[PDB]
Write a structure and sequence with these properties.
With about 190 residues, the protein is mainly β. The protein contains one helix and 15 strands; from the N terminus they run βββββββββββββαββ. Its EC number is 3.2.1.8.
Length: about 190
């Protein structure tokens, strides 16, 4: 069902929906591992379904439609504790490449495409433990897609080779993030 910002479990899957309060975003929890996001002249938001906690070897499946109209990303997104890390495995994005301003560390081939690996540091930014300083790891897919399977192990291993040691996995979801744009999406996670 269409809900206001929050987290919980819907039809067997963990979900997380958040927005900056700007308005113009509609998140709806669908059947099974499905969720739909419809936005127009929105602010910043992150919404999706997945697991809590996630794992370091989970093969995530997603399918559906992703129609961004401006700045937006479709990716496997999650967190880690000790060390506190926010990560992204971007499968598709709109007009803005989220790796802009990030330092490229390397490349990795996974699930039918090469990914560019990046790392950025977020100083005194909100996190799952409140305002904190943490690194942000990125894996941007060269061949965009809205359906497929992501073998998280391939990414976590590539990141580990570049100097990343993930600790305790917190949530791991397939999320749609929008940044002052418009669009629609209906993704089903498995």
């Amino acid at each position: 069902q269409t809900i206001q910002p929050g987290t919980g479990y819907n039809n067997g899957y963990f979900y997380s929906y958040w927005n900056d309060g700007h308005g113009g975003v509609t998140y709806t929890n669908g059947p099974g591992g499905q969720f739909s996001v419809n936005w127009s002249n929105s602010g910043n938001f992150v919404g999706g379904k997945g697991w809590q906690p996630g794992t370091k070897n989970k093969v995530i499946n997603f399918s559906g439609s992703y129609n961004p109209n401006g700045n937006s990303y479709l990716s496997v997104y999650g967190w880690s504790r000790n060390p506190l890390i926010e990560y992204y495995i971007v499968e598709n994005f709109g007009t803005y490449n989220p790796s802009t301003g990030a330092t490229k560390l390397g490349e990795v081939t996974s699930d039918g495409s090469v990914y560019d690996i990046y790392r950025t540091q977020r100083v005194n930014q909100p996190s799952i433990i409140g305002t904190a300083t943490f690194y942000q790891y990125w894996s941007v897919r060269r061949n965009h897609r809205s359906s497929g399977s992501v073998n998280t192990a391939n990414h976590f291993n590539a990141w580990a080779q570049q100097g990343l040691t993930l600790g305790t996995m917190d949530y791991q979801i397939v999320a749609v993030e929008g940044y002052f744009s418009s669009g629609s999406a209906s993704i089903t996670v498995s």
